[PDB]
Amino acid sequence: IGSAKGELENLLKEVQHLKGFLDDAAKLPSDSEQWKVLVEEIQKTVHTAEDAVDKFVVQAKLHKEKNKMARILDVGHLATVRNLAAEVKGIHDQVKELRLNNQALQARPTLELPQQGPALEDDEVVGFDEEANKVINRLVKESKDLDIIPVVGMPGLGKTTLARKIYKDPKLSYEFFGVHWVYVGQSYKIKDVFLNILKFFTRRTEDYQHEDVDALAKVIAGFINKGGRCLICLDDVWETKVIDYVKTIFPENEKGHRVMMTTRNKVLATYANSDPHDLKFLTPKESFELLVKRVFGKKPCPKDLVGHGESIAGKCGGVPLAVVVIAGALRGRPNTSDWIRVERNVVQHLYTNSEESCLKFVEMSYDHLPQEVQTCFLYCGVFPRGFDIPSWKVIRLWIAEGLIKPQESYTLEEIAEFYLNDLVNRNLVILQQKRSDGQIKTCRLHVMLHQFCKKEASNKWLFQEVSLTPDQAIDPNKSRRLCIQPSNLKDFLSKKPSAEHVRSFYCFSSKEKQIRGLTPNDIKLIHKAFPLVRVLDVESLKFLFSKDFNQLFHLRYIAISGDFNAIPLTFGKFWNLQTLILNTSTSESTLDVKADIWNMLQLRHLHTNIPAKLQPPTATTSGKASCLQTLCMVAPESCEKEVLAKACHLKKLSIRGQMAAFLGAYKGGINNLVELKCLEQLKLLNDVLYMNKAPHLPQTFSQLVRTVKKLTLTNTRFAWSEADKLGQLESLEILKFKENAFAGDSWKPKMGFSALRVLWIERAEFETWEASEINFPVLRNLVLMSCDKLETVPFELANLSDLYEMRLENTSKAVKSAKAILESKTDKNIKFNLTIFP
Amino acid sequence: IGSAKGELENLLKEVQHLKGFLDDAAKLPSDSEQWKVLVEEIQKTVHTAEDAVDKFVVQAKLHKEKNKMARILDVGHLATVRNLAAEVKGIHDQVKELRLNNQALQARPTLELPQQGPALEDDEVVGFDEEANKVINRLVKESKDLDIIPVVGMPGLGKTTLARKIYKDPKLSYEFFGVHWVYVGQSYKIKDVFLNILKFFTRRTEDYQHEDVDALAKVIAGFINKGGRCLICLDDVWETKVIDYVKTIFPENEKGHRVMMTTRNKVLATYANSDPHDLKFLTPKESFELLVKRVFGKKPCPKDLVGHGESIAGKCGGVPLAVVVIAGALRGRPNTSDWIRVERNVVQHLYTNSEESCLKFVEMSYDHLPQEVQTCFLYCGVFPRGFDIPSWKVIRLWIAEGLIKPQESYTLEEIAEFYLNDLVNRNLVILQQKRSDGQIKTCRLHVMLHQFCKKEASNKWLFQEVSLTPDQAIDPNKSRRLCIQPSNLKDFLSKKPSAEHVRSFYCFSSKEKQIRGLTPNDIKLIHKAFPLVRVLDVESLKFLFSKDFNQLFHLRYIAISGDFNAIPLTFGKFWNLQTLILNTSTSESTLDVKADIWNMLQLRHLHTNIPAKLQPPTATTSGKASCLQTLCMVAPESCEKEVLAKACHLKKLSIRGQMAAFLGAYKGGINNLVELKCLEQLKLLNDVLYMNKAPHLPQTFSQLVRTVKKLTLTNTRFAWSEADKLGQLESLEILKFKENAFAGDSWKPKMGFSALRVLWIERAEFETWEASEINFPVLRNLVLMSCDKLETVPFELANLSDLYEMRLENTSKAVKSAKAILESKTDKNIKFNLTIFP
C-alpha cells in the first residue's frame, strides 16, 4: 500500500481532535439548535471516519492473509483499496473543512464553559409508618457512644421524607432533649453547617460567626453538654468528611447522642453505620394511594380513574418521586382520556414537562460518577426495561464496547466488576441476586433510571432502541448501536435494513425462550444489515452460519444460539473476537471447536452450554500465553499439557464429562492443571450416573489447584472421606457440592479449611454431619438446599465466630437444629440470619 | 548540501515557537479534552522535528567524515539526504499548519490564564506521644532568649498534627502563660497574622485594625510583657521573613518566650533553629493503627481484613497523609475484595479520587520549585520505586537529559549537586546516605512523591514506565523516554520494539545483580529498537558491542556491563557522549581504552570498574583542554604528561596498580599530576599484596596535589611517619585511609593538617595513636572502622573545638576511650555524637 497509510494516520489525528471536541461538548450545556446540528454532524463524521479506517485495516489484513500470487493477481483488491482510499480522502477533507470553518472547534486552554416541596403533613406520607418506627427504635436505643443511623436509598425514594417524619415524631421529643435538622447537601461549607447547628442552641450566632471550625465544634459540644441527649439530622450527605466533622460536635458525656443522616451512597452509609437502614420501596397499593393523594389531595379518586391510576402507580416502580412526577402529569385532568394517555407511557412522562423532577435528581447522582463509570451506567439501559441483567454479561459488553480502559494492576474484568459494584453502591443499579462470593450475580435498572439511561444514550448517540409505531421507523441513521426486542425484529428486518454505521446489535429475550417466527432468511438479513458490527449479542433465535456471517471480521462479542455441532473454522478469522458465548441445542455431547482459537489473540472468554472439545495448539501457534480468562464447559479430553499451557492465565475453568477417566494416573490431564498460574474458579462436573468405580481425589490435587478460590463439584459421587483432601487447598474460599457430589450416609470431616468462607451443599443425600469448630474456622455462610435427608446441622458450628448467615432450602428435620443454633447465637446476641423456605 | 540547511533553520525557529507554547501550556490548567489532544499533537510534532533535525545533523557529520572520493561516489548518502530533506519539509509544513490553523498558538503579551480536617482527639493521634514529649521538653527548657523550635518534615507527615497535639498538651499550660496558635500559610499577610496574634491578648482588635505592622508588633509585645512567658505556634511557614517578623512581637524581658513553627523546608528550619526537630515517620504498626482508626473509627478491624490492612499500611511509607488517603479509599468497604483491590496497588489510590489529598499537598511544594529543579525532580521517578538513587548517577542523568542549563561560575555538576541538595532541603527527596564531604551519596523518593513524579512525567511526556498487564503494552508512542524493569524486559523485546521517538532507555536493577535470562539477540533487539537513544542507562545485563550499537551516534550517557577487554574505537564516533560508565567482568587486569576519547569533546565523565589504560593524545588531537571532569580507575601507566595535560580540568581521579612504580623518580607519571588545575579528589590504590620495598611519598607530593580536597589511599602500606607529609597539603579537607593504607604499630603525627575536616581510617592494623590538638586543629569528623587492634583514641582530641562527630565501627577496646571522650565533652556540654556498631 502506498501513501494511504499516511492518509489514515492524518485522518486519525484529525478524528482525535473531533473526538476531544465531542467529549468537551458533552460537558457544555447547549440550548442552540445550530450547536446541536454541528455536534450531530461531528459525531456522524467521527463515526464515518472510524468505519472507513476499520474497513481499510480489515482489507489490509485480508490481503496479507492471501498468498503472494493471489495478492498480485487480485485486481478486485486493487479496486476495493482504491475505493477505500477515496473514501478516506473524502472523509479527511470533510474533517478538515469542519475544523477550518467552525470557530467552535478551536481548542481553548481551560475553557469548557458551564429547594424542597411544600411540606408533607403526617397523613400525606404513605407507607413510612413502620419504617419510621424502625428508625426511631434504633435511634432511641440506649448506648454510651455516638451512633449514626443512615437512611440510604436511590434518588427520590423518600429518605428525606422519612427523615422529616421521624424528626417530627412526638416519640423522639420524650427521648431527646434536642432534635435538630441540618441540610448538608452535595455543595456545602462546614462553617455554614456548624453555624446552622449552633442556631438550635443559641440565638446569638451573630456572636460566633468569627470562630473557626474547631472552635465552633467545641461551642456546640458545650451547648449539647448543657442540654442533654441530642439528635442531629444531616440531610443529603455525599462525603464521609461530613460524618467526621459532625462527630466532633458531640461531647463525650456518655449520654448516647444520635445522628440520622440521609444519603444515596451505600458505602458512605456503611462508614456511618455497619448496618445502614435501606429505605423501602412503596408497594403498588401505597404507590396508588400516593398518586391519589397527589392528584386529588384529600378527595377520593373518581371511580372511572381507579383502574388507570392503579396501572399508572404500578409502573412507577415503587419510588415516590416517580409517583409525584406522574401525579404532576395527571393534576387537574380527571378525564379518562388523559389518564389513558399517561398510562400508555408512564416512564416517558418522567423526564418530560417542566416538573421533570426525575431528571435533575438523577443527574445529581450521575454527575458524581467518573467518565468511565458514567458511560458504563448508560450501557445498562441497553437491556430491556425490567431485564434481569447478568453481571458477567454486562461486564463483558462493557469490555467489548471499549468502555473500560486497561489499568496496570487490574484485569479489565476486575475494573468492570468494580464499576458495576460502584453503580450498585451509589444506588444507581438495583441488585437482587448475590453470588456466593458476595458479588453481584444479576442486577437491574429502575424504570426511572432506565429511562434516564435510554434518553442519555440517545442524546449521546451511544445506542438506540428500535421502536416502531405501527409502520415507520421511530432516526436509525443517528445511532451507533441498535437495540431491538424479538417482537419488533421481524418488522425491522422486513424493511431490509442496511446500516453500515451500526456497530452493536442487541436482541434481548426479556420473555425468556420466546423464540418467535424468524426464518433463516431473517438471520441472513441480520448478517447483511450490519457488516461492521462489533457486538452481536442476540440469544433468542436459531442462528445459522451463512457466508455473510463469516465476513463480520470486526466482531468483539458474540452471544448466539442454535443447533451447532461445532464452531467452524470461519470463527478463527475474527481476530478481534474477545467474547464467544454459544448455546447449542445439538444432541452432540460435546462441541468441536474447529476454530483455531489460539491465534485469536484478543479472545478472552469462551462460553458454551455443552463441553467444548478444544484442539491443542500446533507448533506454529506456539508463542506468548493466550489472553483467555474464561473457559467454560471444556471436556476433560481437551485439558492437555499444551492446551493448558497456552491458557496458563485462565481464571475460570469448568469441566464436564467422565471425571473418572480424568483423575487417573495416565489420565494426568488433571495434572496438566498445574500449568495455570491464576486459576480462581474450577467446576468439575460428571455426566454419567452409572459408575464402574468410585473415583478418587489424587493426592497431588492439593497443589494441582492451589490457586483456586472457588471449587464446584457436581455428580462426582465421592466418598465423604474424600472431602478431607479439600482442606489442604490454601486459597479455597468458596466451596460448592451439588447433585450428589459426595456420596455416603454421614460426613465426619477431620481436616480444617483454613480460608473457606462459604460452604454450599445441594441435594446431599447424607443423613448426619458431625462437623466441629476446627473444621471451618473462618466459615461465614452455610447454604444447604434440597437436603431432605440431613438430620441435624451440628451445634458445634454455633460457636464459630465469623459465621453469621445460614440458609436451609427444602430442608428436613435439620431445620430444627438450625433453629437451635439461631436461638443459641441470639442468646449470645450475635448478628445472625437464618432463612427457611418455604 | 543545498537549501536543506535553510529548511532546517526555519523548522528550528517554528519548533522554538511550538516549544514555547508547550512550556506555556504546562502552566495553564486545562479541562478541555480538545486542548489535551492539541497539546499532545504539538508535543509529538516537536519530538518528530527534533528527531528529523538530529538525523540530518548526524548524516551530515558522517558524510563529512568520509573522504572526498567516498563522499562523491556515495549515492546512498544522496538518497538518505533526499529522504531526510523530504521528512524535514513535511514536518515544517505540519508545524506551519499547526500555527496557522489554531488560534491557541497565537502569542500573547502576559496572557497565561491561570482548610483542615475535622480535628483530632488526642487518642486519634498515633505514634506522636514521644515526639510531642521531646518537642515539649525543648519548648519548656528555661532560657533567657527567644527560642524557635521548628517541626520540619515532608508533606503530609503530620507536622501540624503534632503541633496541635503539643498546643493542646496540659503540660504547656503550667509552663506558659499564653499558648496561641497562628496559621501563617504560603500566601499570607503579616498584618493579618499580627491581628490574629493580637486577638489572643485583646478582644478589641477592631480598635487596632488601623495600626501599622511595627505598631501592632509593639502592641503585641506590650501585651505579652503584661502576660508572661508565651508560646506562639506558627503553622506552615514558607519564608524566613515570617520568622523575622514574629521575633519583633516578643518583649526583651528575658522570660524565655517560645515559637513552635511547622514547615516543609529544612533550610528555613535551620535558620529558625540550628537543631530543627525532624518529625518521624510512622512505623508500619503505627500506620496500620492509623488506618484502622481512620476506616473503622473506634471499632476494631475485622479479622479477615487485618492482613490486607497491614499490607496496605506498610505500602504507605509511614506518612500519615498516605494512610489517611488510603483509608478514604477503604471507608465503608469492609469486604475482603475491596481491601484486596486497594492492596494490589496502593500508590495509585493516592492521587486518584476526589480525596486525592496527596496531589494538592505535593503540588504545594512542587510549585515552589524553579522550572529546572521542577524537571530535575520528576526525573527522579525514572528510577524504580524504592530504588536507592546514587547522587552521582542522577546528577549525570540530569546533565545528560539537558535539564541543567550552564551557568557562568558553576560547572554543570555543581549546579546539579545544588539542585539535588535543594530537593532534599525542601523534603521532596529522602536522603539516607551521606558522603564524607557532607553531601548526598544516595537519595530516595518517597512512594507518594514517586507516584507524583511518575504521573507528572507521564502527563508531561518526559518519560514512562513500561508496564504490561499479562499481554498488551500498558501508549508507548506517547513517551519520549522509556523505563523498564529487567523482569519486564524480555516480554517487551519479544514484541520486537521499534520506537524512533524514544530517546532514553532505563533499566534499573532494584533487585541488584539479578541478571535474568536475556540472550545476545535480546541485546541486539535493544540496539535496534532505539537508534536515536541519547541516554542508555542499563546495568543489569551482559552487554555486547554489535554493529547496531555502533550506530547510536546520539548517545550522551551510557551505563553498561558485560565482559569487555577494551572500549572499541567505535565509541570514538559517539561525538555527543558525556558519561561513559563501564562495569566489565573480564579477568584482564585493566581496560584498554582504544577509543580516541580526546576527540570526544563532549566527554565529561569516564567510569570503569577496572583500571583504564588510556592512550596518549596524538599530535593531531592536540588542541583545547578536554572537558573531562572525572577519570575513575585510571592505571598509573596512563597518567602521562600529555594525557594529564589534555585533561588539566580534571576534578576526580582514581588510580590503581603498582604504586611503587608510580612514586619513583623516573616514574614521574606522579609528577605529571601538576598539569591538573582543579583536581579535587584523588584516590591512590594498590593491587599487590607482596611488596619488594615499602614505597615513599615524594617530597614534591606536597605541591603535586596541592589543589586536592579529598585524598584516598588504599593498600599502599606506608610507614606511619609518611602520614606527616600529608599535612603540607593546603586544601586537604577529607582524608581516607583504608585496607592497610599505612603500616606500622603506632602513629605519632607531628605535622598538623591545617584544613582537614574528616579523618577516615578503615581496617588499620595499628595498635596505638598519640595524636594531639595541634595535629587536627579543625577536625570535625573522626570515623574509624575495623580497628580491631587500635588501643585508645587519644583524649587529646577531646579538646578539639570543632570535633562533634566520631564513629567507631567494629572497634576494639578503643571504644572505651571513645566513651571517655564522649563523657568529657558531655561534661563540657558540647554538642557531640558517638556511634558504635554493633
Ligand SMILES: Nc1ncnc2c1ncn2[C@@H]1O[C@H](COP(=O)(O)OP(=O)(O)OP(=O)(O)O)[C@@H](O)[C@H]1O
Ligand atoms: N412516602 C412518601 N409519601 C409521599 N411523598 C413522598 C414519600 N417519599 C417521598 N415523597 C416525595 O418525594 C419528594 C421529597 O423528596 P424525597 O423524600 O423523595 O427525597 P430523598 O429520598 O431524600 O431523595 P433525594 O434527596 O436524593 O432527591 C416530595 O415529592 C415528596 O412528596
Ligand SMILES: Nc1ncnc2c1ncn2[C@@H]1O[C@H](COP(=O)(O)OP(=O)(O)OP(=O)(O)O)[C@@H](O)[C@H]1O
Ligand atoms: N500521627 C498522626 N496520627 C493521626 N493522623 C495523623 C497523624 N499525623 C498526621 N495525621 C493526619 O494526616 C493528614 C496530614 O497530616 P498533617 O496535616 O498534620 O500534616 P503536615 O505535616 O502539617 O503537612 P502539610 O505540609 O500539608 O501542612 C491529616 O489528616 C492529619 O490529621
